[PDB]
Amino acid sequence: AKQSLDVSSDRRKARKAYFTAPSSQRRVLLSAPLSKELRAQYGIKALPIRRDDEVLVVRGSKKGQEGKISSVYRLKFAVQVDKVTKEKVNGASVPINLHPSKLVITKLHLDKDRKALIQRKGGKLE
Amino acid sequence: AGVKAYELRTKSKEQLASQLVDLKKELAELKVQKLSRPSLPKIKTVRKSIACVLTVINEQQREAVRQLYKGKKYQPKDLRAKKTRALRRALTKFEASQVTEKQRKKQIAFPQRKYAIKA
């Protein structure tokens, strides 16, 4: 249950805040859980998805397909994975939008800021 | 591309003026080429570089004037704080804290004592 007077349970306010969230807030909203291997290797549960991460689809018709993120398309709350596409009738390939909550992160794109974030969350960072 | 403000801030007044003139010449050439090209998205970078150079030149000029007026009465109004019209009208801390020494003697002799009730 909810205890603080600074937080609201209004569904209308929650949905307005979600749909009008700016890009920086959408970064956090688009978080993906780590795989078992990375969870053991890093000691953390979920991270905000990045463009060069490697992911595995665990839900939907594309479940089981691996790949690398190609775009974190924050404007429509979706990520695009290379080699996960739909083939249109006119020979063209179109990326398929996926939600990071339905993915799992298998290999993490790392730099100074990501490593600092992992340690800030309590990551061993093998 | 585009210039960087922290890099401009190490340059002197004349170097910045020369850079501004060069950027305006480059913008003129780009505006000429735009009439021939279907799209020239590179004009935006040069425009923003011009804006940044003007910002740094203004910063140096205003800081020099602040140095001239440092530690003296009657600063220029654009260099004075712009809190609010009513806030600038309001009495200063010293003026608001002025008391007659009849009241100063009263306050000194009989301040609000702190006390506790036992039971």
Partner: protein, 99 residues
């Protein structure tokens, strides 16, 4: 109009009374605010007891002179008899009434 056997009523509602209807929806909210204000003031003036000592006085009129009640403040004669000045009594939490 007048009909049947009913008492004569005097409902004063011939002005624009609906413009000046006060409903105390905020009774609970203001009780909470008063309790918060008291807690804040107690913390601010701690350990002072949040209210001055008041004298005992006789209520006026024939209807209430059988009762005593708290007055505004002690008289200057009462403070002098107790052995302190009015200025100091006001600083140590005694309400003083000069009139």
């Amino acid at each position: 109009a007048i009909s049947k056997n009913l008492p004569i009523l005097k409902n004063h509602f011939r002005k624009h009374w609906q413009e000046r209807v006060k409903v105390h929806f905020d009774q609970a909210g203001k009780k909470v605010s008063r309790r918060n204000a008291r807690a804040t003031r107690a913390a601010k003036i701690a350990p002072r007891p949040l209210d001055l000592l008041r004298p005992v006085v006789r209520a006026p009129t024939v209807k209430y002179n059988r009762k005593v009640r708290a007055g505004r403040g002690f008289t200057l004669a009462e403070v002098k008899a107790a052995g302190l000045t009015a200025a100091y009594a006001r600083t140590i939490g005694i309400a003083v009434d000069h009139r």
